[PDB]
């Protein structure tokens, strides 16, 4: 199909990969740091989602350098993915409006 849809699909799949890789890598980075809570995989996956969506409740977060770098990648991938879907939606509406005119 068209580019904007392919990119949206690709961005979504990629986002899911980053959430999975990020959850695993966050636990690896945080264990060994006294006080870290982002240390078991199930809640790390939850953490990765609320990070990618930019909600950031504060129930979980990284305290180490690498856990934070992993977090930054998760944030940017999430913002970029949703931004790209918005961009695809705009392309869709714009194309249609041209049609409604000619």
């Amino acid at each position: 199909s068209a580019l904007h849809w392919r990119a949206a699909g690709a961005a979504t799949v990629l986002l899911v990969i980053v959430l999975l890789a990020g959850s695993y890598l966050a636990v690896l980075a945080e264990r060994g740091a006294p006080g870290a809570q982002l240390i078991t995989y199930p809640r790390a996956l939850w953490w990765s989602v609320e990070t990618a969506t930019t909600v950031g409740y504060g129930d979980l977060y990284p305290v180490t350098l690498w856990g934070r770098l992993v977090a930054v990648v998760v944030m940017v991938a999430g913002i970029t993915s949703f931004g790209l879907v918005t961009a695809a939606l705009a392309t869709w509406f714009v194309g249609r409006a041209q049609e409604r005119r000619g």
Partner: antibody
Amino acid sequence: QVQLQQPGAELVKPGASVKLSCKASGYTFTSDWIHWVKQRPGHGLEWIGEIIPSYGRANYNEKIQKKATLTADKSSSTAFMQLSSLTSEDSAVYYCARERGDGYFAVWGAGTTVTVSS
Amino acid sequence: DILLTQSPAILSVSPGERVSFSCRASQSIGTDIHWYQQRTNGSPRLLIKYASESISGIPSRFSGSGSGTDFTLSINSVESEDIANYYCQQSNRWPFTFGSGTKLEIKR
């Protein structure tokens, strides 16, 4: 079948070192962590450290004099704990346990009785 | 690091009576507490995970409760095989820590 295999015992002369093993069978995931716990006679369970075989990173109890060094051999599904320069304080049963990255020790090894004596 | 307190260290109960072991965390750990049983010369055995979740193979008699800083492991109608040491363990913060243990004694 026995998920975690540990030798029954190890005799070590004071000052020397010994390498304990923990052979795992059963389901194995890249996300499994192998933990080591020390228990002196008549006392409780003391957490020593952990290692993730798929990556090889290890963490240790910082609160106690560091006597251990953890390694893992992926091909033989065996985890190792190197204890060096031991004293009578190091004599105890050392258990290895498997954690699926979800916080609890689902299964434990039989433990290796380590004795420091001349 | 989280200090897990188990008091009393020894509990004497009569047969068939309900018993409760206490485990207190130095700070709130949600429900990230797990219980293990260790009989004489035996290895530890998982009884309850995340405060109250059942483990297959463990008798219905065992149950757990609590959240925050205070947790309880209970046994409905104690019998001889329950004589052992009981430990709590937390996985809320790194590093994982163990309670000091409680011994179960039966007065026959």
